[PDB]
Design a protein around this nucleic acid. Sequence first.
RNA 1: AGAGCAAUCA
RNA 2: GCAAUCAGG
RNA 3: ACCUGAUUGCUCU
Length: 2003
Amino acid sequence: MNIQKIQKLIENGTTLLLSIEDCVGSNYDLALDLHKRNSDEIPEDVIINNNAKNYETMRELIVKITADGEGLNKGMATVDVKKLSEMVSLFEQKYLETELARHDIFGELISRHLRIKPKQRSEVEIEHALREYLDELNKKSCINKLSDDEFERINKEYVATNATPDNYVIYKESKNSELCLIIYDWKISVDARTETKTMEKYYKNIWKSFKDIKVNGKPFLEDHPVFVSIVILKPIAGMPITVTSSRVLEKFEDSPSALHGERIKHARNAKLLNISHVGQIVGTTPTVVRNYYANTQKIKSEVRGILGDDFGSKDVFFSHWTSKYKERNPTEIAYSEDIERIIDSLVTDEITKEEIIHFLFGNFCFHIETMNDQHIADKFKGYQSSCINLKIEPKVDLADLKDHLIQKQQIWESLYGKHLEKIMLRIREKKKKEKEIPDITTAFNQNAAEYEEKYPNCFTNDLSETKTNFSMTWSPSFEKINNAIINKFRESFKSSSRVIYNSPYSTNKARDITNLVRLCLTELSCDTTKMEKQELEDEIDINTGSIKVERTKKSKEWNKQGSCLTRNKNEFCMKETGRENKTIYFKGLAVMNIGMSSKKRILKKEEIKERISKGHMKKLIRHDNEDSLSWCERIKDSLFVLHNGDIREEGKITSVYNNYAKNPECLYIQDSVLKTELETCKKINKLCNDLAIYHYSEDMMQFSKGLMVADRYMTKESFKILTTANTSMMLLAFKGDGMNTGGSGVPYIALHIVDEDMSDQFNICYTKEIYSYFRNGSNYIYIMRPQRLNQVRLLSLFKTPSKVPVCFAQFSKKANEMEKWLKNKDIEKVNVFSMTMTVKQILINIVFSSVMIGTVTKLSRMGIFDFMRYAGFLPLSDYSNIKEYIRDKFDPDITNVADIYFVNGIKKLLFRMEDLDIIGGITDLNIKCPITGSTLLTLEDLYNNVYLAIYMMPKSLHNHVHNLTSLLNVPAEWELKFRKELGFNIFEDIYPKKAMFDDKDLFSINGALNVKALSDYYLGNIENVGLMRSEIENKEDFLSPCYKISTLKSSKKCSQSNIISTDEIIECLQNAKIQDIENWKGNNLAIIKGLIRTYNEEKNRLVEFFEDNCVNSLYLVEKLKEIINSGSITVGKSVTSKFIRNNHPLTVETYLKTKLYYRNNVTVLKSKKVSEELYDLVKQFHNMMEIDLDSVMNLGKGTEGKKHTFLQMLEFVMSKAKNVTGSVDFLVSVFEKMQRTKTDREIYLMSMKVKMMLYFIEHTFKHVAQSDPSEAISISGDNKIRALSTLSLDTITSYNDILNKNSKKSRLAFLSADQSKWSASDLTYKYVLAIILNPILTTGEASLMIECILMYVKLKKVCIPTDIFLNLRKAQGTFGQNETAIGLLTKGLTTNTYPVSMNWLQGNLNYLSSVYHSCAMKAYHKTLECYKDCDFQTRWIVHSDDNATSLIASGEVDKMLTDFSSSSLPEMLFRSIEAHFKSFCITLNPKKSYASSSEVEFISERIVNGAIIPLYCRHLANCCTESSHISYFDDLMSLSIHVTMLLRKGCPNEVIPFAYGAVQVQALSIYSMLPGEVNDSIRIFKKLGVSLKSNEIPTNMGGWLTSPIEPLSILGPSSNDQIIYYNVIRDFLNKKSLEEVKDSVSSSSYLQMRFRELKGKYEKGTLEEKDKKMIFLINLFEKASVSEDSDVLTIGMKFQTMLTQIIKLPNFINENALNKMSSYKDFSKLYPNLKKNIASSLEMESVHDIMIKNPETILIAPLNDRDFLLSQLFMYTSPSKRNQLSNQSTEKLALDRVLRSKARTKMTYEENMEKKILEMLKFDLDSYCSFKTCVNLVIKDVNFSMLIPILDSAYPCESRKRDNYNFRWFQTEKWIPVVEGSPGLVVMHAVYGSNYIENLGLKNIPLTDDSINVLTSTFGTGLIMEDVKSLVKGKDSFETEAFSNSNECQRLVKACNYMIAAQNRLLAINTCFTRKSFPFYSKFNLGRGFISNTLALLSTIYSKEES
RNA sequence: AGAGCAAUCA
RNA sequence: GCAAUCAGG
RNA sequence: ACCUGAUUGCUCU
């Protein structure tokens, strides 16, 4: 309903009553006129009487509404609005009855004068028309007479359609003529769009009904005529009437029936009507009928004006509009005139300007059959005014437009031959320009020569000049058995100077380092005799997260033991040592380069410029260095000898990996079916144990963890001594750089006690990094180089125990000879001394690969492994990159050796492939790249190894300044290339259309081809335009409030522009008081320092700044002089990005504003939050410029309160953006994406206005993508990718096998394509050209769409970030005085922003670009099918930047390859796609795109002949590298999702226990320390004596991943909790299986009996240990709600789990980001500074009173604006609500968490866990409701209760189940019993991507909701008084939550929801009126406790079948 | 010495 | 790595 | 002003 409509019907009552009285008079005059000539009864009499009674009905209705609405306009509250709405409804259905009656009156009037008069009928339908025509054909004798046998199968094959005609007639010309029928319709309208719509609807459903129906092998319509005749009279002037009649025969667009002239000409020569106007009609008075018809339209204007169009002929779907810019049109009413130059660019000689305009602005008549009404009127008015604005005479009517455009598509169709000869010409031109490289070695040499030209003298033969070999990390094996290692090293270093300084391969720094270590070991370090113990570190809880060891001087006592001053039992400083010792120590620090002498820094910075600039300091090696190859082979052999020297047998990593792989049969339920493969996994585990893979990576973790924690509050004159769990490893971790800045890091010295047995091999191993070594006793002491790691690199070293052992497992499975030797030999006989040379060499290479992949830390490995990502394109047909990719995109950045092994392995594979289900390796005999590994079993193994070594790498290893400068060099170069190519100037604006976008090469489209292709694509894709618009505005939340959209609500970054105003700078300088130099703090001091620094740098800029922004500039200049001459200020020199780091942001903003004034305005973007900025925009819309507490609460009560729409917010954005503000809205910030690559990609922060506009841009094409079957960006998760590529390859292979039966010739090809620069090289004005062709839109939001893209492209400029901008300005000021493309787009780096023009911002346009890529391939299809010689069929799969295009050819194949200048069909496919895309401004990359005959690579996971190469290695890498870092249970949950996906995508026999181990090590090592140390959970449970055994501890309680692999494959990552809960229910309720358990539970008063038995056992004291498990886990389930941190109101949360997170550590929340957040500013403003960090008690009391008064803002997602913006204010109330904001992300949070785990978080982690478990061991009363809902949740799971019996009773093998054994057991017994117990399939082998079958979130989401309601009620009542157990009769909500928390509130409301099923419709009024607490916190959740669902598991496609 | 190759962190 | 003070050059 | 030594504080403005 609409109150605006209810008011608009009131004031029109006078004219409505006059029109109704005139209607009554005209109807009575018509009745008298008919009755005086026909005294008998007529068919018009009944409808005339119905018209009369409905007319007096609406007369009484409008009288009553006019009487009632007198008080509504004065605002009286006693107006019956619902009664007025009901009367409006009665008015409207009475008017609908009169409209139908008037149509029937027209039909009965015209039906007398027909040449074929139809019989009078009331209800008519095409169905009965067709049945009666068929039986009349069967009965009557005619030429086209049907037979009796032919009668039945027409109706059998017939498909019914739903439409409502007006009449139908069957007519005979003569006795021996043909029987035919004519469909009659009677519609009345002024413009012929009704005629066109009705006639095309009738044509289309008759054609769809009779398309497949054939008579005697002929079409049905050829012999049997069906006629459609539609008659319209125009109700203006002299009442002209016309008939449009046509015969349906074929498709309408290919029929002669398309033209209106042929309709009226076919109406002629048969004389259907004898009538030109109704005054000719016999028996009717002309003036009476004309007055009555105009009289009806003079209420048809009014009723349709007020009530809109609620006609509903076929439910119409009520296409709404977008009103404010609705009246405007894309040309001459937008901000700039651009469509005219678009048209002038589009016009050619063959196709003219007026034709281009007509087609472009009127291609809606082609989709005219299924639009709603008045959309036609809006779009045609827009077309008419667009033609008027473009100075072309518009076509007057839709009929003439249709005849025009039919002739125009006839001339349009002869363009694809021109495009075909164009692409043939371009193919033959590109054939003669490419250069054939002779050999792969010469391609490598050419790439090396080009790299040497780019970087001079980089390659060197001096192998000693390279970087470090075995990373910055060494863990040698050791032989002896915390401080003991340290005194061992002290007794080692007390010996004399027999040290031997080492040459790098074949030295004052070495002497200096050896002296420093011998000083720090002899005269500095002492032992652990002191008993003060370690100091525990707390937080500060002001900025919660900053852990402090406190400045209270009890921590900084520094101690003593003689002369050492140790803290924390390992750190010691120097303060009272000798002066010679201090000089030696400082020379050690100078060689270490910790602490820069500024003299040396300035001297080096001047010297490098003087040395280099008169003629990049990279030192390189070549790819063909056989000396390096021999050195690396020695490196390998020495590493294998070194790794076997460990004798340790117990450890920490050894414990978890031995638990998960020593006996992995406990991960199954059928252990006895596979024996040798479990033995193979045990053999791999034993090889890792004996080779100390687990032990070595344990020292890797201890290394990294102690090295991170080794940066603390110490100064430069101290050092920590670090020890791992090794018996002889030690680091000297000195004073660092960061821990919070991401700088260089912590320098250290490594020392080792490798003995004489491994001394020489160790010297071959670490020769590049050994500085000195000397002999002590029977041992050798080795000292390594000074070494640094960044914090991300230390995290990379911390992920080593998840990285290295799974590398060994997967690589040793994929090594053929190693795997078959492991099957040959036995587990008790596998040893290091028992291989042959080949298998031993395989083991050396595989340990090298495991170590060298788990310890990547340099970008060279990124480079070679990206090269190997695109080095697998060789073995399939036309690759075109076996030489070209190596020549162009291979990066030779080999900065050391140990990557020359990878280069040699790939070069050996390259040379073997050059020497010449798909199995590669038995006949190719190729070589694996990382693990050499000959006799390759399957190409799947090679891609799994290579892609795992790619994806298992860390993310952000890039240096920030270099990465950002390269990532800003990319778009500046790619825009300057266009600007210098098409000849525009830097200073001048875009000049958008220069008409050089007409089929040229670099930046151009074809134009006319594009518009024809887009019209064809919309014709072939957009069906049911009205329904598509309806689901667009429904599903994409367009009419929903803007915060309801996840893309606009989710906490991302937007980077709005935010600078301080120059006026504020002026008065901040003016009110400065020089007498208050010591009183300035914060903002004024910041502005003063910025002005001082800018005066120190550039005086004239401030001179002109104050001249142009102030009148008395001399006062400001002399004030600047007085404030520099004061001497109380702290000036600064050039301190680069640290000047950004250690200062207020206000200083650098005023410094940049006063530095960058060149007659312009400069702005700096600050990265704000998306939700906070949307809150700001809601404030700006609703006119709260400043927040008022009463103004928000005074308006917005309930769902009837004030709201907004996304469209209204969008037009408010354009209203605020069209003003002249310098256009700071379209400013994009470039940031570094963490792309796991050497060549980095980038992420973008576009402003919130741009995000809203671009969300509209993108998501109005989301449903266009959804209706496209050949497109894969509208994907249902990641499953639709593989599924729809599977449909492509399966359908194409079936098509080829069909075409190979009885044909002359047929051929097949495929292309996997990656476009070169999908964003930078693409034209964007094709989007402007293509939005106008949308039939979904109308002019009024389409003009908004064009103006969006136009402003977004013309006024777009990217902005340099401030730190790298000032680095570039530093380079300008002191080194360069010249610059690259950034310094040419910018006027010599005097602006912080540079313009990019049509590089559309990558990743933000994902649906539009993919939709238009699919349109381009449809253009390719209709271009290539214009080949008259041959016939081609294609099926394409499209992603943003990615493509998979297939092709099938038949005909004169060899001749067509001769015309296409290709050796084969894949070659012609590659070249034709390249030329065709190059005509679409789509640059196909010739390197990373290969055309095959059997392989498809769409985005990944190549499928061959319909068999997907599984590629589980991406999940295997995601299981070890990426974790969430939020909690331990959260990390285990997130990694178990990837474990389940890994199992579902297929994994071999030996790698999944290692994957279980890897996710366990990642979660435990990060959060809750893995056993053998403190903060363990198994140790804490054993200490507290809980009855649970070690392998069923719940994961939220700190337990391990204990789920079996079958439920972890079928159920999901909650299967561990469900399995342990099912086990304890089966244990307590003493039964045997799940069916018996649920049968015992299904009878009531049984759980009551067991709970009373448990109560009696607890009373007596006879608590047996089975029941102790029961009390503990139901207390865990029942008190998992509150726990710690339940203040989060997370609805729609992840992890599909049962329990909660229990304990979550507080994230670091600085005050700087809080005070930067504007919503926190508004919070601190509306509630003052007493709540910013006794009156604060009353402040929070008021905030909780208005919590409890409106808890809808905090319970569920916001409804109105009184539920959202004040929710954003309330989001900072109390701690653990502020702990959900962090700009920390993944990389720097793990160091915070490992620092938090062993700290006081005041208690600590183990104290909190101990007190929590001690509280859960109690029997808090009335837990029966919790026990009942827990047992109900376990029992009700249908998928679990179907999986468990068929897993317990699964037959093992045979009978077409498990006839194979090669890794198909986790195919068959994982899914085939489950996927035949759940809806059936015919599959045996496949790959699996499942649904959301286990949607177990129906309990944990109300667990979170009941937690937040319980805890906000707890804050409220604990604030309102202390000692709350039962209240003192407060208000009703307080009494109800008292009832709630007197018992277990969560479990009582779960029981309450278990009986009741009320479920009110959530109107925010009635739900509050029924009852407050229990239904408002149960049924507001949009659901209740209900059942789960099971599906068919979605088996995508069949893998290769073995039987 | 180390991280990187935009002349940058120490 | 920074911040300021106190000295020396 | 610019560099070394002695003090305490920041260890994510």
